[PDB]
Amino acid sequence: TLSILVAHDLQRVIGFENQLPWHLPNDLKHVKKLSTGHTLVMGRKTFESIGKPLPNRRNVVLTSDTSFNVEGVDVIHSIEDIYQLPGHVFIFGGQTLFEEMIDKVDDMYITVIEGKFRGDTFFPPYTFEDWEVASSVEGKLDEKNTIPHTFLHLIRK
Ligand SMILES: COc1cc(Cc2cnc(N)nc2N)cc(OC)c1OC
């Protein structure tokens, strides 16, 4: 199964100055729950943002730089390489990988950040004519998670 995994805001912002503009440990816990024991595929910029591979899952970096290597990370150089990865594979970003994969994936796990933040990188537009909401769950708020957010699982219509 090939899935997108993304957190974006009401204007599809997915980053500002190479970071998430919101701080939502609850979203990071969502990511842990979905992807632990599976595979994340991400662009080099997203990898350099997380700094180190996320534990307890396969971390795959897609980059055109054949000189790129990191202990604990598998590196690929083509989109085609993704289709040969075993198991459940989550496309983890960033913008250009999302743009390349949105028409190709089976489903999407989206955290909608229910606010409008500063942004300089964006998830591609999508329509609920192409996507069906399989589940929608409001995120819980606490002192460390202060922005309303909604967890969606979308499948093709
Ligand atoms: C684990 O940390 C980060 C994760 C992400 C990607 C990401 C984060 N959340 C969700 N739901 N999907 C994603 N693809 C992006 C980040 O920065 C841009 C991160 O830095 C904290």
PDB file of N, CA and C in Angstrom, residues 33-125:
ATOM      1  N   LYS A  33       2.365   6.406  15.355  1.00  0.00           N
ATOM      2  CA  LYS A  33       1.402   5.308  15.395  1.00  0.00           C
ATOM      3  C   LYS A  33       1.212   4.700  14.007  1.00  0.00           C
ATOM      4  N   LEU A  34       1.112   5.554  12.986  1.00  0.00           N
ATOM      5  CA  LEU A  34       0.841   5.070  11.639  1.00  0.00           C
ATOM      6  C   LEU A  34       2.049   4.385  11.014  1.00  0.00           C
ATOM      7  N   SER A  35       3.245   4.924  11.253  1.00  0.00           N
ATOM      8  CA  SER A  35       4.411   4.547  10.445  1.00  0.00           C
ATOM      9  C   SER A  35       5.426   3.635  11.126  1.00  0.00           C
ATOM     10  N   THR A  36       5.352   3.498  12.447  1.00  0.00           N
ATOM     11  CA  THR A  36       6.247   2.582  13.144  1.00  0.00           C
ATOM     12  C   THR A  36       6.113   1.174  12.558  1.00  0.00           C
ATOM     13  N   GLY A  37       7.255   0.544  12.275  1.00  0.00           N
ATOM     14  CA  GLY A  37       7.287  -0.782  11.653  1.00  0.00           C
ATOM     15  C   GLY A  37       7.066  -0.788  10.148  1.00  0.00           C
ATOM     16  N   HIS A  38       6.891   0.396   9.563  1.00  0.00           N
ATOM     17  CA  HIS A  38       6.678   0.503   8.124  1.00  0.00           C
ATOM     18  C   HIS A  38       7.804   1.311   7.495  1.00  0.00           C
ATOM     19  N   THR A  39       7.532   2.001   6.384  1.00  0.00           N
ATOM     20  CA  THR A  39       8.567   2.708   5.640  1.00  0.00           C
ATOM     21  C   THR A  39       8.123   4.141   5.393  1.00  0.00           C
ATOM     22  N   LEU A  40       9.017   5.096   5.673  1.00  0.00           N
ATOM     23  CA  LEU A  40       8.849   6.498   5.258  1.00  0.00           C
ATOM     24  C   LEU A  40       9.750   6.796   4.080  1.00  0.00           C
ATOM     25  N   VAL A  41       9.192   7.407   3.036  1.00  0.00           N
ATOM     26  CA  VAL A  41      10.008   7.938   1.938  1.00  0.00           C
ATOM     27  C   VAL A  41       9.900   9.446   1.955  1.00  0.00           C
ATOM     28  N   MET A  42      11.047  10.118   1.939  1.00  0.00           N
ATOM     29  CA  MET A  42      11.046  11.572   2.040  1.00  0.00           C
ATOM     30  C   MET A  42      12.139  12.171   1.166  1.00  0.00           C
ATOM     31  N   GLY A  43      11.918  13.406   0.733  1.00  0.00           N
ATOM     32  CA  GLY A  43      12.953  14.190   0.080  1.00  0.00           C
ATOM     33  C   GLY A  43      14.096  14.553   1.014  1.00  0.00           C
ATOM     34  N   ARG A  44      15.219  14.949   0.424  1.00  0.00           N
ATOM     35  CA  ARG A  44      16.399  15.315   1.193  1.00  0.00           C
ATOM     36  C   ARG A  44      16.157  16.494   2.139  1.00  0.00           C
ATOM     37  N   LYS A  45      15.394  17.486   1.683  1.00  0.00           N
ATOM     38  CA  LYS A  45      15.143  18.655   2.536  1.00  0.00           C
ATOM     39  C   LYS A  45      14.367  18.292   3.790  1.00  0.00           C
ATOM     40  N   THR A  46      13.357  17.446   3.635  1.00  0.00           N
ATOM     41  CA  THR A  46      12.598  16.971   4.771  1.00  0.00           C
ATOM     42  C   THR A  46      13.484  16.152   5.703  1.00  0.00           C
ATOM     43  N   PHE A  47      14.332  15.296   5.132  1.00  0.00           N
ATOM     44  CA  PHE A  47      15.265  14.560   5.969  1.00  0.00           C
ATOM     45  C   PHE A  47      16.166  15.499   6.775  1.00  0.00           C
ATOM     46  N   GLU A  48      16.709  16.521   6.121  1.00  0.00           N
ATOM     47  CA  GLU A  48      17.614  17.438   6.817  1.00  0.00           C
ATOM     48  C   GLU A  48      16.866  18.229   7.903  1.00  0.00           C
ATOM     49  N   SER A  49      15.557  18.406   7.726  1.00  0.00           N
ATOM     50  CA  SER A  49      14.711  18.987   8.780  1.00  0.00           C
ATOM     51  C   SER A  49      14.543  18.094  10.019  1.00  0.00           C
ATOM     52  N   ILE A  50      14.290  16.803   9.820  1.00  0.00           N
ATOM     53  CA  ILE A  50      14.169  15.889  10.957  1.00  0.00           C
ATOM     54  C   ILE A  50      15.533  15.534  11.549  1.00  0.00           C
ATOM     55  N   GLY A  51      16.588  15.721  10.757  1.00  0.00           N
ATOM     56  CA  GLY A  51      17.954  15.595  11.270  1.00  0.00           C
ATOM     57  C   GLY A  51      18.436  14.161  11.341  1.00  0.00           C
ATOM     58  N   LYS A  52      17.641  13.280  11.945  1.00  0.00           N
ATOM     59  CA  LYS A  52      18.004  11.865  12.053  1.00  0.00           C
ATOM     60  C   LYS A  52      16.812  10.987  11.687  1.00  0.00           C
ATOM     61  N   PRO A  53      17.071   9.737  11.273  1.00  0.00           N
ATOM     62  CA  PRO A  53      15.941   8.880  10.943  1.00  0.00           C
ATOM     63  C   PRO A  53      15.010   8.710  12.139  1.00  0.00           C
ATOM     64  N   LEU A  54      13.721   8.583  11.858  1.00  0.00           N
ATOM     65  CA  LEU A  54      12.756   8.288  12.903  1.00  0.00           C
ATOM     66  C   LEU A  54      12.916   6.836  13.315  1.00  0.00           C
ATOM     67  N   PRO A  55      12.958   6.579  14.628  1.00  0.00           N
ATOM     68  CA  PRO A  55      13.272   5.225  15.066  1.00  0.00           C
ATOM     69  C   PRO A  55      12.192   4.183  14.746  1.00  0.00           C
ATOM     70  N   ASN A  56      12.604   2.919  14.672  1.00  0.00           N
ATOM     71  CA  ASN A  56      11.674   1.793  14.597  1.00  0.00           C
ATOM     72  C   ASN A  56      10.900   1.716  13.285  1.00  0.00           C
ATOM     73  N   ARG A  57      11.451   2.318  12.235  1.00  0.00           N
ATOM     74  CA  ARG A  57      10.887   2.160  10.898  1.00  0.00           C
ATOM     75  C   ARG A  57      11.963   2.382   9.858  1.00  0.00           C
ATOM     76  N   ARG A  58      11.683   1.976   8.626  1.00  0.00           N
ATOM     77  CA  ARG A  58      12.640   2.186   7.550  1.00  0.00           C
ATOM     78  C   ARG A  58      12.537   3.626   7.063  1.00  0.00           C
ATOM     79  N   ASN A  59      13.671   4.314   7.022  1.00  0.00           N
ATOM     80  CA  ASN A  59      13.737   5.670   6.502  1.00  0.00           C
ATOM     81  C   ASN A  59      14.444   5.676   5.162  1.00  0.00           C
ATOM     82  N   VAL A  60      13.744   6.154   4.139  1.00  0.00           N
ATOM     83  CA  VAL A  60      14.250   6.196   2.776  1.00  0.00           C
ATOM     84  C   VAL A  60      14.263   7.647   2.296  1.00  0.00           C
ATOM     85  N   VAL A  61      15.428   8.103   1.837  1.00  0.00           N
ATOM     86  CA  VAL A  61      15.585   9.444   1.291  1.00  0.00           C
ATOM     87  C   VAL A  61      15.723   9.409  -0.215  1.00  0.00           C
ATOM     88  N   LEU A  62      14.899  10.206  -0.885  1.00  0.00           N
ATOM     89  CA  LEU A  62      14.944  10.337  -2.340  1.00  0.00           C
ATOM     90  C   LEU A  62      15.662  11.622  -2.713  1.00  0.00           C
ATOM     91  N   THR A  63      16.763  11.494  -3.447  1.00  0.00           N
ATOM     92  CA  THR A  63      17.561  12.646  -3.842  1.00  0.00           C
ATOM     93  C   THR A  63      18.280  12.333  -5.145  1.00  0.00           C
ATOM     94  N   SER A  64      18.500  13.363  -5.952  1.00  0.00           N
ATOM     95  CA  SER A  64      19.259  13.192  -7.183  1.00  0.00           C
ATOM     96  C   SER A  64      20.769  13.118  -6.960  1.00  0.00           C
ATOM     97  N   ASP A  65      21.222  13.527  -5.775  1.00  0.00           N
ATOM     98  CA  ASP A  65      22.647  13.547  -5.439  1.00  0.00           C
ATOM     99  C   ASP A  65      23.153  12.130  -5.156  1.00  0.00           C
ATOM    100  N   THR A  66      23.945  11.581  -6.078  1.00  0.00           N
ATOM    101  CA  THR A  66      24.454  10.219  -5.924  1.00  0.00           C
ATOM    102  C   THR A  66      25.560  10.130  -4.872  1.00  0.00           C
ATOM    103  N   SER A  67      25.984  11.286  -4.366  1.00  0.00           N
ATOM    104  CA  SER A  67      27.039  11.354  -3.353  1.00  0.00           C
ATOM    105  C   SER A  67      26.474  11.410  -1.933  1.00  0.00           C
ATOM    106  N   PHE A  68      25.157  11.263  -1.810  1.00  0.00           N
ATOM    107  CA  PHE A  68      24.483  11.412  -0.522  1.00  0.00           C
ATOM    108  C   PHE A  68      24.350  10.069   0.193  1.00  0.00           C
ATOM    109  N   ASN A  69      24.839   9.993   1.431  1.00  0.00           N
ATOM    110  CA  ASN A  69      24.698   8.778   2.229  1.00  0.00           C
ATOM    111  C   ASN A  69      24.647   9.080   3.723  1.00  0.00           C
ATOM    112  N   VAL A  70      23.805   8.347   4.449  1.00  0.00           N
ATOM    113  CA  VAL A  70      23.627   8.555   5.890  1.00  0.00           C
ATOM    114  C   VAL A  70      23.380   7.217   6.574  1.00  0.00           C
ATOM    115  N   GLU A  71      24.158   6.926   7.613  1.00  0.00           N
ATOM    116  CA  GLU A  71      23.965   5.697   8.365  1.00  0.00           C
ATOM    117  C   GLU A  71      22.533   5.610   8.886  1.00  0.00           C
ATOM    118  N   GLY A  72      21.901   4.457   8.684  1.00  0.00           N
ATOM    119  CA  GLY A  72      20.542   4.225   9.165  1.00  0.00           C
ATOM    120  C   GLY A  72      19.468   4.698   8.203  1.00  0.00           C
ATOM    121  N   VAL A  73      19.890   5.186   7.040  1.00  0.00           N
ATOM    122  CA  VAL A  73      18.960   5.636   6.008  1.00  0.00           C
ATOM    123  C   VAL A  73      19.259   4.914   4.696  1.00  0.00           C
ATOM    124  N   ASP A  74      18.215   4.471   4.006  1.00  0.00           N
ATOM    125  CA  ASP A  74      18.363   3.983   2.641  1.00  0.00           C
ATOM    126  C   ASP A  74      18.146   5.129   1.663  1.00  0.00           C
ATOM    127  N   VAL A  75      19.007   5.235   0.658  1.00  0.00           N
ATOM    128  CA  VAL A  75      18.910   6.312  -0.310  1.00  0.00           C
ATOM    129  C   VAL A  75      18.466   5.772  -1.661  1.00  0.00           C
ATOM    130  N   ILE A  76      17.499   6.447  -2.272  1.00  0.00           N
ATOM    131  CA  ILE A  76      17.127   6.160  -3.657  1.00  0.00           C
ATOM    132  C   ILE A  76      17.227   7.420  -4.510  1.00  0.00           C
ATOM    133  N   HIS A  77      17.283   7.236  -5.825  1.00  0.00           N
ATOM    134  CA  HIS A  77      17.519   8.355  -6.725  1.00  0.00           C
ATOM    135  C   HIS A  77      16.403   8.602  -7.736  1.00  0.00           C
ATOM    136  N   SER A  78      15.429   7.698  -7.787  1.00  0.00           N
ATOM    137  CA  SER A  78      14.306   7.847  -8.699  1.00  0.00           C
ATOM    138  C   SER A  78      12.975   7.531  -8.043  1.00  0.00           C
ATOM    139  N   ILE A  79      11.931   8.217  -8.500  1.00  0.00           N
ATOM    140  CA  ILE A  79      10.563   7.899  -8.110  1.00  0.00           C
ATOM    141  C   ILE A  79      10.236   6.429  -8.351  1.00  0.00           C
ATOM    142  N   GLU A  80      10.709   5.886  -9.467  1.00  0.00           N
ATOM    143  CA  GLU A  80      10.455   4.489  -9.790  1.00  0.00           C
ATOM    144  C   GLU A  80      10.932   3.521  -8.712  1.00  0.00           C
ATOM    145  N   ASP A  81      11.997   3.891  -8.005  1.00  0.00           N
ATOM    146  CA  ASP A  81      12.522   3.070  -6.916  1.00  0.00           C
ATOM    147  C   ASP A  81      11.489   2.875  -5.799  1.00  0.00           C
ATOM    148  N   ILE A  82      10.581   3.834  -5.636  1.00  0.00           N
ATOM    149  CA  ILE A  82       9.574   3.744  -4.575  1.00  0.00           C
ATOM    150  C   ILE A  82       8.696   2.508  -4.724  1.00  0.00           C
ATOM    151  N   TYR A  83       8.346   2.183  -5.963  1.00  0.00           N
ATOM    152  CA  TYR A  83       7.362   1.142  -6.209  1.00  0.00           C
ATOM    153  C   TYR A  83       7.903  -0.244  -5.882  1.00  0.00           C
ATOM    154  N   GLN A  84       9.224  -0.348  -5.764  1.00  0.00           N
ATOM    155  CA  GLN A  84       9.873  -1.612  -5.420  1.00  0.00           C
ATOM    156  C   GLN A  84      10.100  -1.829  -3.922  1.00  0.00           C
ATOM    157  N   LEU A  85       9.805  -0.819  -3.105  1.00  0.00           N
ATOM    158  CA  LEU A  85       9.924  -0.979  -1.656  1.00  0.00           C
ATOM    159  C   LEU A  85       8.816  -1.876  -1.099  1.00  0.00           C
ATOM    160  N   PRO A  86       9.192  -2.873  -0.280  1.00  0.00           N
ATOM    161  CA  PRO A  86       8.218  -3.794   0.301  1.00  0.00           C
ATOM    162  C   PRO A  86       7.355  -3.168   1.396  1.00  0.00           C
ATOM    163  N   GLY A  87       6.110  -3.629   1.494  1.00  0.00           N
ATOM    164  CA  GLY A  87       5.251  -3.308   2.627  1.00  0.00           C
ATOM    165  C   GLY A  87       4.461  -2.026   2.452  1.00  0.00           C
ATOM    166  N   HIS A  88       4.041  -1.457   3.574  1.00  0.00           N
ATOM    167  CA  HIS A  88       3.298  -0.208   3.564  1.00  0.00           C
ATOM    168  C   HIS A  88       4.281   0.950   3.531  1.00  0.00           C
ATOM    169  N   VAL A  89       4.176   1.766   2.487  1.00  0.00           N
ATOM    170  CA  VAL A  89       5.104   2.857   2.273  1.00  0.00           C
ATOM    171  C   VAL A  89       4.341   4.170   2.394  1.00  0.00           C
ATOM    172  N   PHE A  90       4.872   5.073   3.212  1.00  0.00           N
ATOM    173  CA  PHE A  90       4.276   6.389   3.411  1.00  0.00           C
ATOM    174  C   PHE A  90       5.168   7.443   2.782  1.00  0.00           C
ATOM    175  N   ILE A  91       4.594   8.214   1.861  1.00  0.00           N
ATOM    176  CA  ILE A  91       5.258   9.380   1.288  1.00  0.00           C
ATOM    177  C   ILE A  91       5.163  10.520   2.304  1.00  0.00           C
ATOM    178  N   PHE A  92       6.318  10.978   2.770  1.00  0.00           N
ATOM    179  CA  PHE A  92       6.425  11.818   3.971  1.00  0.00           C
ATOM    180  C   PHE A  92       6.730  13.281   3.632  1.00  0.00           C
ATOM    181  N   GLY A  93       6.950  13.574   2.354  1.00  0.00           N
ATOM    182  CA  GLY A  93       7.199  14.946   1.910  1.00  0.00           C
ATOM    183  C   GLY A  93       8.609  15.082   1.398  1.00  0.00           C
ATOM    184  N   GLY A  94       8.994  16.273   0.935  1.00  0.00           N
ATOM    185  CA  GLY A  94       8.213  17.493   1.084  1.00  0.00           C
ATOM    186  C   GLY A  94       7.386  17.831  -0.144  1.00  0.00           C
ATOM    187  N   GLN A  95       7.238  19.129  -0.405  1.00  0.00           N
ATOM    188  CA  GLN A  95       6.371  19.614  -1.469  1.00  0.00           C
ATOM    189  C   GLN A  95       6.556  18.907  -2.813  1.00  0.00           C
ATOM    190  N   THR A  96       7.779  18.838  -3.323  1.00  0.00           N
ATOM    191  CA  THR A  96       7.938  18.274  -4.668  1.00  0.00           C
ATOM    192  C   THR A  96       7.624  16.771  -4.711  1.00  0.00           C
ATOM    193  N   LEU A  97       7.928  16.039  -3.642  1.00  0.00           N
ATOM    194  CA  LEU A  97       7.575  14.621  -3.627  1.00  0.00           C
ATOM    195  C   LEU A  97       6.052  14.447  -3.527  1.00  0.00           C
ATOM    196  N   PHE A  98       5.392  15.280  -2.718  1.00  0.00           N
ATOM    197  CA  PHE A  98       3.933  15.264  -2.689  1.00  0.00           C
ATOM    198  C   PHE A  98       3.338  15.560  -4.065  1.00  0.00           C
ATOM    199  N   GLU A  99       3.880  16.564  -4.752  1.00  0.00           N
ATOM    200  CA  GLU A  99       3.385  16.923  -6.081  1.00  0.00           C
ATOM    201  C   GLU A  99       3.536  15.764  -7.064  1.00  0.00           C
ATOM    202  N   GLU A 100       4.637  15.028  -6.941  1.00  0.00           N
ATOM    203  CA  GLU A 100       4.925  13.900  -7.830  1.00  0.00           C
ATOM    204  C   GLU A 100       4.083  12.668  -7.518  1.00  0.00           C
ATOM    205  N   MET A 101       3.632  12.548  -6.270  1.00  0.00           N
ATOM    206  CA  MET A 101       3.011  11.304  -5.814  1.00  0.00           C
ATOM    207  C   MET A 101       1.499  11.369  -5.602  1.00  0.00           C
ATOM    208  N   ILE A 102       0.934  12.571  -5.506  1.00  0.00           N
ATOM    209  CA  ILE A 102      -0.479  12.659  -5.142  1.00  0.00           C
ATOM    210  C   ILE A 102      -1.410  11.922  -6.108  1.00  0.00           C
ATOM    211  N   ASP A 103      -1.054  11.897  -7.393  1.00  0.00           N
ATOM    212  CA  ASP A 103      -1.867  11.196  -8.397  1.00  0.00           C
ATOM    213  C   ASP A 103      -1.624   9.684  -8.395  1.00  0.00           C
ATOM    214  N   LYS A 104      -0.627   9.247  -7.629  1.00  0.00           N
ATOM    215  CA  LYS A 104      -0.138   7.871  -7.686  1.00  0.00           C
ATOM    216  C   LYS A 104      -0.474   7.045  -6.453  1.00  0.00           C
ATOM    217  N   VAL A 105      -0.691   7.705  -5.319  1.00  0.00           N
ATOM    218  CA  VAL A 105      -0.854   6.958  -4.071  1.00  0.00           C
ATOM    219  C   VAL A 105      -2.258   6.375  -3.976  1.00  0.00           C
ATOM    220  N   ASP A 106      -2.401   5.369  -3.123  1.00  0.00           N
ATOM    221  CA  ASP A 106      -3.692   4.749  -2.876  1.00  0.00           C
ATOM    222  C   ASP A 106      -4.577   5.607  -1.970  1.00  0.00           C
ATOM    223  N   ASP A 107      -3.975   6.221  -0.964  1.00  0.00           N
ATOM    224  CA  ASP A 107      -4.750   6.937   0.044  1.00  0.00           C
ATOM    225  C   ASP A 107      -3.889   7.995   0.724  1.00  0.00           C
ATOM    226  N   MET A 108      -4.507   8.805   1.580  1.00  0.00           N
ATOM    227  CA  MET A 108      -3.807   9.898   2.256  1.00  0.00           C
ATOM    228  C   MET A 108      -4.238   9.968   3.701  1.00  0.00           C
ATOM    229  N   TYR A 109      -3.250  10.085   4.574  1.00  0.00           N
ATOM    230  CA  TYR A 109      -3.486  10.375   5.974  1.00  0.00           C
ATOM    231  C   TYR A 109      -3.078  11.812   6.206  1.00  0.00           C
ATOM    232  N   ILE A 110      -4.078  12.673   6.361  1.00  0.00           N
ATOM    233  CA  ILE A 110      -3.842  14.102   6.441  1.00  0.00           C
ATOM    234  C   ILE A 110      -4.201  14.599   7.833  1.00  0.00           C
ATOM    235  N   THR A 111      -3.283  15.331   8.445  1.00  0.00           N
ATOM    236  CA  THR A 111      -3.629  16.135   9.606  1.00  0.00           C
ATOM    237  C   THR A 111      -3.907  17.542   9.109  1.00  0.00           C
ATOM    238  N   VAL A 112      -5.175  17.952   9.159  1.00  0.00           N
ATOM    239  CA  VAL A 112      -5.523  19.331   8.822  1.00  0.00           C
ATOM    240  C   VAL A 112      -5.317  20.192  10.056  1.00  0.00           C
ATOM    241  N   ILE A 113      -4.362  21.107   9.964  1.00  0.00           N
ATOM    242  CA  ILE A 113      -4.154  22.089  11.000  1.00  0.00           C
ATOM    243  C   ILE A 113      -5.172  23.186  10.746  1.00  0.00           C
ATOM    244  N   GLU A 114      -6.106  23.339  11.677  1.00  0.00           N
ATOM    245  CA  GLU A 114      -7.263  24.199  11.461  1.00  0.00           C
ATOM    246  C   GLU A 114      -6.927  25.640  11.817  1.00  0.00           C
ATOM    247  N   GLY A 115      -5.949  26.175  11.096  1.00  0.00           N
ATOM    248  CA  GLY A 115      -5.516  27.546  11.268  1.00  0.00           C
ATOM    249  C   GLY A 115      -4.822  28.008  10.004  1.00  0.00           C
ATOM    250  N   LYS A 116      -4.416  29.271   9.989  1.00  0.00           N
ATOM    251  CA  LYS A 116      -3.704  29.841   8.845  1.00  0.00           C
ATOM    252  C   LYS A 116      -2.385  30.415   9.337  1.00  0.00           C
ATOM    253  N   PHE A 117      -1.295  29.715   9.021  1.00  0.00           N
ATOM    254  CA  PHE A 117       0.050  30.069   9.473  1.00  0.00           C
ATOM    255  C   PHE A 117       0.858  30.696   8.345  1.00  0.00           C
ATOM    256  N   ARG A 118       1.959  31.349   8.711  1.00  0.00           N
ATOM    257  CA  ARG A 118       3.004  31.685   7.751  1.00  0.00           C
ATOM    258  C   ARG A 118       3.483  30.432   7.027  1.00  0.00           C
ATOM    259  N   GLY A 119       3.677  30.525   5.712  1.00  0.00           N
ATOM    260  CA  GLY A 119       4.149  29.373   4.958  1.00  0.00           C
ATOM    261  C   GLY A 119       4.921  29.752   3.717  1.00  0.00           C
ATOM    262  N   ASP A 120       5.843  28.876   3.316  1.00  0.00           N
ATOM    263  CA  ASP A 120       6.600  29.075   2.076  1.00  0.00           C
ATOM    264  C   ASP A 120       6.765  27.772   1.307  1.00  0.00           C
ATOM    265  N   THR A 121       5.979  26.774   1.693  1.00  0.00           N
ATOM    266  CA  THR A 121       5.927  25.518   0.964  1.00  0.00           C
ATOM    267  C   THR A 121       4.545  24.906   1.208  1.00  0.00           C
ATOM    268  N   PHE A 122       4.018  24.232   0.190  1.00  0.00           N
ATOM    269  CA  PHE A 122       2.580  23.962   0.099  1.00  0.00           C
ATOM    270  C   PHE A 122       2.298  22.557  -0.402  1.00  0.00           C
ATOM    271  N   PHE A 123       1.293  21.928   0.195  1.00  0.00           N
ATOM    272  CA  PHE A 123       0.752  20.672  -0.316  1.00  0.00           C
ATOM    273  C   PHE A 123      -0.076  20.980  -1.574  1.00  0.00           C
ATOM    274  N   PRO A 124      -0.056  20.087  -2.579  1.00  0.00           N
ATOM    275  CA  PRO A 124      -0.846  20.365  -3.782  1.00  0.00           C
ATOM    276  C   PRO A 124      -2.351  20.415  -3.507  1.00  0.00           C
ATOM    277  N   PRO A 125      -3.083  21.233  -4.276  1.00  0.00           N
ATOM    278  CA  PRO A 125      -4.525  21.264  -4.109  1.00  0.00           C
ATOM    279  C   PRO A 125      -5.150  19.928  -4.467  1.00  0.00           C
TER     280      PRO A 125
END
